Design a protein around this ligand. Sequence first.
Ligand SMILES: O=C(O)CNC(=O)c1nc(Cl)c2ccccc2c1O
Ligand SMILES: O=C(O)CNC(=O)c1nc(Cl)c2ccccc2c1O
Ligand SMILES: [Fe+2]
Length: 216
Amino acid sequence: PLPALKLALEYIVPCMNKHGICVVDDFLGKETGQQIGDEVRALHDTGKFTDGQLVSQKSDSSKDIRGDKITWIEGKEPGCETIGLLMSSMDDLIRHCNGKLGSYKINGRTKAMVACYPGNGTGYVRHVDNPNGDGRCVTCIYYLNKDWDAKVSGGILRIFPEGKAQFADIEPKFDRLLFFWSDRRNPHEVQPAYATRYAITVWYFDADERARAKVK
Ligand SMILES: O=C(O)CNC(=O)c1nc(Cl)c2ccccc2c1O
Ligand SMILES: O=C(O)CNC(=O)c1nc(Cl)c2ccccc2c1O
Ligand SMILES: [Fe+2]
């Protein structure tokens, strides 16, 4: 459903409230997805990303292993127009969920974090996005890896939902949109990536949790 409204009301709200996780495929379409892919790859090739999260040292600094590289995008930067549009689509979508996602009242968003795992076997250890109540209630991730083959490239996002035995494996599939509670209900990890892996994350703020963040 293109109008975010039907998708938000008939799928996203119900899914988030029952599962705390929601997967939406073919969110923007091939044409738009590829345009974002192209903008993200230009950022990388023009050196706009960091050098990567320091994974290992071992006192010889050229034997230092670095992982995910990142860059923060506000949405208006020249050359990042399609990303700004993606961001606007996530926003319109969240706006349609107002008063429906838990008992939260979203009133803000972080800038978009574009992450690129180099594909050198690095990943992201199990973690909780917001474990100390910093205001972030919902994590939103947009994937842009065409023909991703987890069986050969790894890089699967594994979420250990609620506090129930199983976990949920989600492939960083092209044009896929993902939503999940940012707090302790969703510990998760990015398994080792053996191929270049791109994703765009945005975190939405709950009005109350954020307002008291400096005093909690
Ligand atoms: O930029 C601002 O208005 C103040 N920033 C924040 O409130 C803020 N808080 C958090 Cl927890 C994050 C967390 C990640 C990235 C950006 C953040 C951010 O801008
Ligand atoms: O990309 C994915 O499928 C899942 N990614 C994450 O869970 C993730 N989380 C955090 Cl908090 C960061 C934080 C910084 C850079 C990358 C991150 C990341 O990829
Ligand atoms: Fe995360």
